[model samples]
Target: GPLGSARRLYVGNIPFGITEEAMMDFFNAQMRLGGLTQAPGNPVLAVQINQDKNFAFLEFRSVDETTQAMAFDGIIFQGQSLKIRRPHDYQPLPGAHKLFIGGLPNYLNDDQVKELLTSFGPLKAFNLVKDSATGLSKGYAFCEYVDINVTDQAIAGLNGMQLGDKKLLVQRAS
Candidate 1:
């Protein structure tokens, strides 16, 4: 499975003779420098290798470290630069041109959600995500700034703006 688990990485380009312990050591040190921390020593939890294929797998503590370590893609280790990538099972999501209004309170509805959009400009369109079966909010929305100019402005202005016990998740809906 590609990118099978968020905490796991499928790495390639293992120079022959490099051991799993060595792989963990190099990657572990790299991420520490890259800034993966919370507990102690190293976040690298486990390492598995397939010498026949000249590749390996590094399982970290969490997605946060995996994401941070993704910076290691194409980085050099031992005698060869490793080809770091997601597993075969991961499917990337596609996007469109619009705005994502996330981190919303469940109590918010269409008109109430639209009120937030006015901060950007006239809303061209908006969709409040909901649970079909329960008929309740999914606590997020997608919107469009009628005026394209405000799109970036809205994101800059609203993202991370604390409200309702949390910050907004304003971003490109597409």
Candidate 2:
């Protein structure tokens, strides 16, 4: 009951007969090939598996390591492709100056969204709401700017605008 938290990840598509140590070794070795320089132990802190579903919950030492692990989504192991996902309900601690940006193109990513938002000012917090199962963009996100005063300008500048044929919305989230 002390899990389902953090920077946790849902990694599925495991070969049914694999041992837990084998799975852990696969991930730790992959992270090494992905160019992480760290202390001599595994970056993946723990693995909790669901043998019935062929999925495992993985926890990492830091957000940076976890973020790096995400890129292994389509990695192959034992002839099966892995599915890496951010478990639904992942959120950092809430704070002030929040703004909702919505009605966006489905192709947008973290950098793309930030590039648009940075026009107003630096962001204090931001996350593109993504589908937990597919890891696809939800076309909506919530964020906060370092300068709260820029809120008005962001809404005024971005809201009701057409990025192609779709209209974008930027306003107070709650």
Measured by TM-score, the strongest candidate is: 2
For model 2, the stretches where C-alpha displacement exceeds 4 angstroms are 1-4, 93-174
Tens-place lDDT digits, model 1, residues 27-103:
77777676766557788989998888888888888777777777778887666888888766543332334877778
* Candidate 2 lDDT by residue in tens digits, 135-156: 8999999998766668789999
Model 2: lowest-lDDT 10 consecutive positions: 88-97
Give the lDDT of residue 115 in candidate 2: 95
lDDT scores in order? 0.78, 0.82
Candidate 1: global Cα-lDDT?
0.78
User: What TM-score would every model get versus the actual structure?
Assistant: 0.51, 0.52
Reference-based TM-score, model 2: 0.52
